[PDB]
């Protein structure tokens, strides 16, 4: 994956994950907050634990990119809602919750 380098927050995937330009219920952090572990609402909906080695080993990098594009269940589809370059940065954010 193409590494996101720290920079201006208007270009950052964290600003998108934290809900810039999205309804709260369509923002990653609303379901995948508490550090990727899942919020109260996210756990009700069935989110996996992004900090978990076992979750991370269940997906390839390509599968994470394809997932963010397609959505699944209560996880929304984001194709056309952010650029392909941002989706790839976002896949890196998902990975980085388990990078210690």
């Amino acid at each position: 994956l193409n590494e996101h380098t720290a920079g201006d927050t208007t270009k950052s995937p964290y600003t998108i994950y934290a809900g810039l330009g999205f309804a709260v219920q369509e923002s990653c952090y609303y379901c995948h907050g508490n550090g990727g572990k899942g919020t109260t609402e996210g756990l009700i909906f069935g989110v996996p634990d992004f900090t978990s080695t076992e979750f991370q080993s269940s997906m390839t990098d390509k599968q994470i990119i394809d997932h963010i594009n397609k959505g699944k269940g209560k996880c929304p589809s984001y194709q056309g809602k952010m650029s392909p370059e941002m989706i790839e940065k976002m896949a890196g954010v998902v990975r980085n919750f388990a990078v210690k």
Binding site: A6, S12, Y14
Partner: protein, 111 residues
């Protein structure tokens, strides 16, 4: 061995001192001075969190993006460019909020 909560507490007065000045036309030399001191205090806080609080790689990059904007405020203050200080402070505020919303999602936090 400071906790993240202690770092945030120690950053609040520098942040609120910065906020109080970004809405002025002013360029008091002492106020430009205090602004650089406030920016350095923030840089020091997020460096201490970034270094001594091992969470995960995202946590480190979030700290770095606060530092990116804090350093930019420092440079804009040194260049007597209040327009840029203002824009960078807004963007630093977002950077602070990004970490709060991602890691302390269900606690109401400032700013």
């Amino acid at each position: 061995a400071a906790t993240q909560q202690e770092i945030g507490k120690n950053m609040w007065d520098p942040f609120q001192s910065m906020r109080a000045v970004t809405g002025l036309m002013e360029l008091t030399s002492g106020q430009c001075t205090q602004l650089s001191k406030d920016a350095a205090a923030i840089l020091a806080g997020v460096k201490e969190s970034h270094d001594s609080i091992s969470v995960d790689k995202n946590y480190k990059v979030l700290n770095d993006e606060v530092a990116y904007h804090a350093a930019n405020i420092d440079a804009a203050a040194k260049a007597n460019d209040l327009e840029e200080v203002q824009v960078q402070f807004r963007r630093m505020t977002i950077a602070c909020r990004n970490c709060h919303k991602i890691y302390k999602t269900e606690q109401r936090l400032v700013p």
